[PDB]
Amino acid sequence: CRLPPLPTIREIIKLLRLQASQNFLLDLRLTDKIVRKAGNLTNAYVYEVGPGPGGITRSILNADVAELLVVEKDTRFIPGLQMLSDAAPLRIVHTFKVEKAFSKRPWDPPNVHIIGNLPFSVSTPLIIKWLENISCRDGPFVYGRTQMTLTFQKEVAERLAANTGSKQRSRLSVMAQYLCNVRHITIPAFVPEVDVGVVHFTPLIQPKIEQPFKLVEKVVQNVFQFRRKYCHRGLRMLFPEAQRLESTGRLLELADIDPTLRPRQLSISHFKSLCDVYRKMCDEDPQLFAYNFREELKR
Amino acid sequence: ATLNQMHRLGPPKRPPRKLGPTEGRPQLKGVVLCTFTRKPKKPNSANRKCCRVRLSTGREAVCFIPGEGHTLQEHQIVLVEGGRTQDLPGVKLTVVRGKYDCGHVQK
Amino acid sequence: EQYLELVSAALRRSLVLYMVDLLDLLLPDLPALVGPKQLIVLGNKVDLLPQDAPGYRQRLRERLWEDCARALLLTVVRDVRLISAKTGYGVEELISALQRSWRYRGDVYLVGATNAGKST
RNA sequence: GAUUAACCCAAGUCAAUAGAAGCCGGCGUAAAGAGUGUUUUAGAUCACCCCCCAAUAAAGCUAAAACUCACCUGAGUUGUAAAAAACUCAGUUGACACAAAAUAGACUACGAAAGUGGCUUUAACAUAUCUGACACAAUAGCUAAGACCCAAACUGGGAACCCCACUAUGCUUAGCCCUAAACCUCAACAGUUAAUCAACAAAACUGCUCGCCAGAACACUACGAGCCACAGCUUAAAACUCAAA
RNA sequence: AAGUGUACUGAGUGCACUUGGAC
Numbered sequence: 204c205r206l207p208p209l210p211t212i213r214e215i216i217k218l219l220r221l222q223a224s225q226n227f228l229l230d231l232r233l234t235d236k237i238v239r240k241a242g243n244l245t246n247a248y249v250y251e252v253g254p255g256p257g258g259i260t261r262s263i264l265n266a267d268v269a270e271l272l273v274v275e276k277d278t279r280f281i282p283g284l285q286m287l288s289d290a291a292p293l294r295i296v297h298t299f300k301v302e303k304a305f306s307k308r309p310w311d312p313p314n315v316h317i318i319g320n321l322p323f324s325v326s327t328p329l330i331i332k333w334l335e336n337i338s339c340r341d342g343p344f345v346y347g348r349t350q351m352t353l354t355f356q357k358e359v360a361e362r363l364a365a366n367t368g369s370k371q372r373s374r375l376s377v378m379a380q381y382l383c384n385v386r387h388i389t390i391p392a393f394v395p396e397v398d399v400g401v402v403h404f405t406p407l408i409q410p411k412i413e414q415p416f417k418l419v420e421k422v423v424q425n426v427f428q429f430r431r432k433y434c435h436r437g438l439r440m441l442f443p444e445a446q447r448l449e450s451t452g453r454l455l456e457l458a459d460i461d462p463t464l465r466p467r468q469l470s471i472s473h474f475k476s477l478c479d480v481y482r483k484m485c486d487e488d489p490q491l492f493a494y495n496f497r498e499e500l501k502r
Numbered sequence: 503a504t505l506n507q508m509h510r511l512g513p514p515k516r517p518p519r520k521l522g523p524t525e526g527r528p529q530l531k532g533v534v535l536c537t538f539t540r541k542p543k544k545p546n547s548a549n550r551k552c553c554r555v556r557l558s559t560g561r562e563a564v565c566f567i568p569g570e571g572h573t574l575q576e577h578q579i580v581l582v583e584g585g586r587t588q589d590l591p592g593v594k595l596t597v598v599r600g601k602y603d604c605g606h607v608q609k
Numbered sequence: 610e611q612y613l614e615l616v617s618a619a620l621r622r623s624l625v626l627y628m629v630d631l632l633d634l635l636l637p638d639l640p641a642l643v644g645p646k647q648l649i650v651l652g653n654k655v656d657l658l659p660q661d662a663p664g665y666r667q668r669l670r671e672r673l674w675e676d677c678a679r680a681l682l683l684t685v686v687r688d689v690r691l692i693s694a695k696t697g698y699g700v701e702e703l704i705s706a707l708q709r710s711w712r713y714r715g716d717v718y719l720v721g722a723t724n725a726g727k728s729t
Numbered sequence: 730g731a732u733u734a735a736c737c738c739a740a741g742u743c744a745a746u747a748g749a750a751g752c753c754g755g756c757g758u759a760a761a762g763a764g765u766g767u768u769u770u771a772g773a774u775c776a777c778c779c780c781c782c783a784a785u786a787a788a789g790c791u792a793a794a795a796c797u798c799a800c801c802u803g804a805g806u807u808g809u810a811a812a813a814a815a816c817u818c819a820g821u822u823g824a825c826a827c828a829a830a831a832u833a834g835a836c837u838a839c840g841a842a843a844g845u846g847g848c849u850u851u852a853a854c855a856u857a858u859c860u861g862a863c864a865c866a867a868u869a870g871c872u873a874a875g876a877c878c879c880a881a882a883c884u885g886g887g888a889a890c891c892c893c894a895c896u897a898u899g900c901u902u903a904g905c906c907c908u909a910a911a912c913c914u915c916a917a918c919a920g921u922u923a924a925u926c927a928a929c930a931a932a933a934c935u936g937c938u939c940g941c942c943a944g945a946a947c948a949c950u951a952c953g954a955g956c957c958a959c960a961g962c963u964u965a966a967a968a969c970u971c972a973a974a
Numbered sequence: 975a976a977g978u979g980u981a982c983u984g985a986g987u988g989c990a991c992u993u994g995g996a997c
């Protein structure tokens with residue numbers, strides 16, 4: 204399968220009309236390594252995001268994929284992707300709804316993979332949205348437990364794949380880990396001051412917290428708001444000041460969380476217990492879930 | 503320093519000399535593994551023949567093959583001495599022409 | 610069996626300190642022996658173990674953790690620690706951990722094998 | 730790469746390795762004066778001639794300005810480049826702090842250092858007539874309880890940076906952590922101005938003592954250890970690389 | 975403007991400090 208040569212940085216500057224704010228991985232070897240780590244893509248349906256110059260696209264097409272749905276935002280790269288499609292008779296498209304994209308296994312992976320090398324300013328909202336999509340069993344995951352392979356900054360990937368007690372444990376860690384098996388598989392290599400890690404997400408058959416995504420997110424955020432204080436310091440804020448002390452004590456006691464534990468020493472089981480107790484409290488008190496302590500303090 | 507300080511600290515403790523690429527020996531034996539070419543640092547550019555050889559101490563090292571023409575091949579026995587090449591960063595050994603499988607420079 | 614029929618009745622009426630000989634590696638029978646209560650694993654005779662590589666203490670703690678997972682909730686095991694009664698290594702930290710938290714209230718039952726070093 | 734010629738040594742030649750070359754030099758800017766003070770054993774001869782300001786702790790107190798609450802009025806107030814967002818609140822007057830301390834201060838004092846600039850009182854600012862490891866150590870941070878006007882990491886809203894509100898936190902108590910461009914980047918003590926001197930910086934030196942440095946990066950890193958009580962600080966390497974830095 | 979320390983966030987911000995910046 205002969206494909207056009209990869210554009211060098213000279214042609215890229217000419218194409219963007221700069222004549223002299225983005226980093227391109229133009230290393231086909233590294234793209235091939237990433238595609239390899241993505242798994243066996245033979246006759247698989249691949250959804251590609253952040254196409255850019257198209258090294259990832261070339262590597263994935265080299266992999267014997269059946270359909271490869273490219274989603275691009277910039278119109279200056281569409282000509283190159285069209286040339287790629289002609290060379291390999293690649294479905295290019297310019298909030299995107301992937302659910303209707305492909306022609307669905309019950310919750311093995313449904314032969315549908317997602318590959319993304321996007322700007323780090325856009326990956327984090329995207330991964331949060333897809334985590335919510337997994338929680339709701341919708342979006343790209345209508346077809347089942349679709350596997351994802353995304354490039355993040357090194358620190359962000361370490362936080363995503365961080366373990367309990369690891370210095371990088373944080374909200375992103377808990378949110379990603381209670382819904383997905385997350386594996387950090389790092390690139391120093393880009394033609395244009397940070398390292399890049401590659402992370403693979405596989406949705407879990409049995410999620411470790413069977414609670415609404417927004418509820419879990421609120422609980423985790425309030426827990427981690429004070430990363431250097433005892434967990435109760437950050438948990439007490441979930442309740443109005445009037446009943447703060449008693450409500451926090453009841454929460455901790457009905458759960459089995461030791462108040463001395465710091466936020467990063469909390470396991471997904473601890474978070475599950477906290478979320479269940481908080482769900483009960485919200486159910487028996489309608490106003491609690493919408494409470495915002497800073498909004499209250501505004502008065 | 504003061505005289506008392508010099509007396510207390512005694513004579514200088516000369517650090518042990520780091521073992522060269524040949525681990526202190528003027529020569530070693532090895533088995534060639536893979537031959538190839540390398541590009542010297544600019545301005546020098548002429549291709550230079552190197553070969554990965556497993557020394558008598560198990561260690562594998564890239565060794566420059568001097569001269570023009572050879573017959574070195576996989577699993578062939580060579581003798582390698584020290585001496586870094588001017589313009590081959592990393593390469594820090596040289597096959598001694600005229601020993602074992604290294605038939606003399608094929609002039 | 611004698612322990613099951615004499616002492617387990619008293620124990621199943623609190624905290625259990627289960628001592629395990631690090632060199633020798635009863636664990637799967639703990640649920641019947643002690644019952645569903647708080648348990649802390651103490652790997653004894655650690656000083657006699659050579660330091661094969663850095664972080665061997667962490668590796669041993671991990672290995673004990675998978676062994677317990679094979680056999681138990683992580684009966685619940687709340688802490689795995691490595692101690693050497695002969696050298697007094699980690700005993701003070703164990704004492705501090707015992708006194709630092711609410712979870713460790715009540716009586717303490719020191720369970721283990723004959724050679725584990727319970728006397729020491 | 731070949732050819733000519735030449736040079737050195739010569740029955741040798743010279744590629745590799747190893748050794749011989751090794752501390753009386755420096756420390757403001759290059760590595761280096763350790764954040765600060767005090768010992769012992771010692772060391773040196775410099776021992777003999779020889780008030781008060783803004784230290785520190787405690788107790789008490791408050792002039793201006795805030796916030797809140799009262800009336801009285803007004804309907805907008807706030808916000809800025811300009812608007813949004815927000816509040817129905819705003820102005821005068823009065824009451825009124827556990828916050829901070831104009832002016833003096835163009836002064837240069839106190840303290841070992843960090844620091845110390847509202848007032849009063851109490852206690853009080855070691856010492857030989859030398860140098861020299863337990864006690865302190867700004868801001869930040871943690872634990873428990875209080876205070877919370879104002880400011881404000883973070884969050885949210887409005888069109889990172891700007892505006893609005895608000896939290897840790899800045900504050901009191903009782904304990905912890907021990908790091909700063911902890912800097913006059915110039916160690917203590919004694920002495921001198923005799924002949925100037927890499928450059929710049931705070932003119933140059935002598936004596937004396939302690940501490941510290943032996944190319945760069947690896948590396949305020951890893952391993953171990955101590956403090957921890959587990960996410961961190963102190964101590965601190967090696968290998969590989971380079972002829973630089 | 976630059977930097978030191980420290981903490982949050984994902985390079986900025988907060989507090990103090992230095993001029994190894996300008997007036």
Ligand SMILES: [Mg+2]
Pocket residue numbers: 861
């Ligand atoms: Mg003294």
Ligand SMILES: [Mg+2]
Pocket residue numbers: none
């Ligand atoms: Mg000292």
Ligand SMILES: [Mg+2]
Pocket residue numbers: 866
């Ligand atoms: Mg301090």
Ligand SMILES: [Mg+2]
Pocket residue numbers: none
């Ligand atoms: Mg506050």
